[PDB]
Amino acid sequence: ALTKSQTDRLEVLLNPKDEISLNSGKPFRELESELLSRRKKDLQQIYAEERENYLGKLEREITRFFVDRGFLEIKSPILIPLEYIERMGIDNDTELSKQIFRVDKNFCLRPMLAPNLYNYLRKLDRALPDPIKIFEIGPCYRKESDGKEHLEEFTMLGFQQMGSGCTRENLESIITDFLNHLGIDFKIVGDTLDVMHGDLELSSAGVGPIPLDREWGIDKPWIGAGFGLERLLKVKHDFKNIKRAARSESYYNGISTNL
Amino acid sequence: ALTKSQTDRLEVLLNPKDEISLNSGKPFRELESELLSRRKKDLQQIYAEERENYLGKLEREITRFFVDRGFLEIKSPILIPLEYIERMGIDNDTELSKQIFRVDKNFCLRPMLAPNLYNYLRKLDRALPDPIKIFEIGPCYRKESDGKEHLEEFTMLGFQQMGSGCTRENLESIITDFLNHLGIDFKIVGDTLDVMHGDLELSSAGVGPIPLDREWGIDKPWIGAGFGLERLLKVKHDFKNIKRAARSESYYNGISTNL
Ligand SMILES: Nc1ncnc2c1ncn2[C@@H]1O[C@H](COP(=O)(O)OP(=O)(O)NP(=O)(O)O)[C@@H](O)[C@H]1O
Ligand SMILES: Nc1ncnc2c1ncn2[C@@H]1O[C@H](COP(=O)(O)OP(=O)(O)NP(=O)(O)O)[C@@H](O)[C@H]1O
Ligand SMILES: N[C@H](Cc1cccc(Cl)c1)C(=O)O
Ligand SMILES: N[C@H](Cc1cccc(Cl)c1)C(=O)O
Ligand SMILES: [Mg+2]
Ligand SMILES: [Mg+2]
Ligand SMILES: [Mg+2]
Ligand SMILES: [Mg+2]
């Protein structure tokens, strides 16, 4: 009989496509040696053939999708003014206010892309023709309880369109084309618009104007959404825990690095 | 006569390829309106034609270079254990110990990629054939005095090879091919190996083994280097201040967003 600790170890080495049973009478040491051999070959094949990281590769594929669709690629600060949090309406009565990683006395690690995207929409409206379409992909940070769907360090895609054409139908079309392009199954569940995979939230999306826009110097209609890249990878690759998809020292493209 | 404040404003709108003189008798308001028109057209042309961010595009071009050359693409944590700093030999007598952005009580924003690259070399040596070649590109953070060559939030490329072929000559060949591929002029100045553009340091590079390797479980020869992407962009585009190349709300591909 395998111990729970032994089973935890084998689960670290198990990949979703393996068809190995941990509840059949082979001893731990030989089930471990089998999976170790498989995972070493997996890494050797990546090293020999493609050599790209899942998170980097997904970011580049999403970038090509949105650039192609007419969205400007933004790279804005990750370390942001603490003031941006309150100005997003995130006060002591929200879950998020307790989730901020503060840095120094006036800065924090951004928990979302919305403040920077708002600032870019306002500034670019002075220069670019209507409608203004932008997107950003990059690290975001939230303190979280331990859970198979949450990372404290994750990667967000955020896109926003401002001006003409900012309808819920156009927003759903972007989301639908995007996820069908990636091969991710989803349901849009009705502003309040969430993109679900089963009970996992892939995205929250919105349609403006909303009262908050005024604080950011925004007075035009808009649509947009935010997506977690590690959740997309978790669904795409059928990972049991989002840790497999994270920036990590423990996993490379979902393969354990502790061999 | 232009005021210094007026000149600062015009310098924000000036791009290196402009051939406009701020010391000739045109009034401020018309020099400003001229440069505003030019910068709006610059942004409109980016939006119409390519839509890619300089920092993102450079990261993707560097990624293709190193992948093609046989290096595995790594994406490791940006928020790292504080312990990694001391284990890198960075104690109270180094400049760096005073430059760390601490997060919480046991974490910090990484000021360099070396700790994570060391960990990946050790782990991958259990699985990959000799030599082991890896690289990472991503955010790094250091507290800095105000200066035209330093950002507090920047982007590092780090690469490392471990095992056979780890000679200074092979290291210089990687650097030389890399910078000639990017079109960046440089001089290698002699371990202690720095890559200079004039008096600007583009990279510091090294040849192991060194005593520090032991703390990280490394006992093989190695070569590697770290490069700042915003310094490469600053040189490539002849920016006067590295702020033009940063993750920023103030500049897009070196164009002022305050129009
Ligand atoms: N801790 C996290 N780790 C990974 N991805 C996240 C995390 N928090 C949010 N995301 C993703 O970012 C997107 C937009 O963020 P947001 O809608 O604010 O998250 P949220 O509503 O807190 N989701 P949840 O925490 O699962 O209820 C979401 O659709 C998630 O896929
Ligand atoms: N604050 C910064 N902003 C942008 N790039 C940086 C910064 N610090 C270091 N880099 C780049 O990262 C590379 C490796 O880092 P490292 O050699 O530790 O920097 P360094 O020796 O402190 N350079 P300097 O601070 O200019 O004397 C350097 O060659 C720089 O190009
Ligand atoms: N950071 C994302 C990005 C986003 C997209 C559209 C509109 C807005 Cl305001 C924000 C989110 O929180 O869902
Ligand atoms: N973070 C870089 C990366 C690097 C490359 C090779 C060897 C080492 Cl140990 C470190 C630097 O500090 O120069
Ligand atoms: Mg949440
Ligand atoms: Mg949500
Ligand atoms: Mg320095
Ligand atoms: Mg140096």
Summarize the structure.
Chain A has helices at residues 4-13, 28-49, 54-68, 83-87, 114-124, 168-182, 229-237; strands at 72-74, 79-81, 102-103, 107-109, 132-141, 153-162, 187-189, 193-197, 200-208, 222-228, 251-252, 255-256. With 259 residues, chain A is of the alpha+beta class. Chain A folds into 2 domains: 1-51, Helix Hairpins (Orthogonal Bundle); 52-259, BirA Bifunctional Protein, domain 2 (2-Layer Sandwich), CATH 3.30.930.10.
Task: Walk me through this protein's architecture.
Two copies of one chain form a homodimer. The first copy, chain A, is an alpha+beta fold and 259 residues long. Chain A folds into two domains: 1-51, Helix hairpin bin (Helix Hairpins); 52-259, BirA Bifunctional Protein, domain 2. Helices cover 34% and strands 23% of the residues of chain A. Chain A has seven helices and twelve strands. Chain A has helices at residues 4-13, 28-49, 54-68, 83-87, 114-124, 168-182, 229-237; strands spanning 72-74, 79-81, 102-103, 107-109, 132-141, 153-162, 187-189, 193-197, 200-208, 222-228, 251-252, 255-256. In chain A, the strands form three sheets. A seven-stranded mixed beta sheet of chain A has the order 1-5-6-10-9-8-7, with helices on both faces. In chain A, a hairpin with a 3-residue loop joins strand 3 (102-103) and strand 4. In chain A, helix 1 (4-13) runs parallel beside helix 2. The PDB classes it as ligase. The entry lists the keywords tRNA Synthetase, ligase. It forms a dimeric assembly. The entry is titled "PylRS C-terminus domain mutant bound with D-3-chlorophenylalanine and AMPNP". Chains A, B are Pyrrolysine--tRNA ligase. Organism of A, B: Methanosarcina mazei.
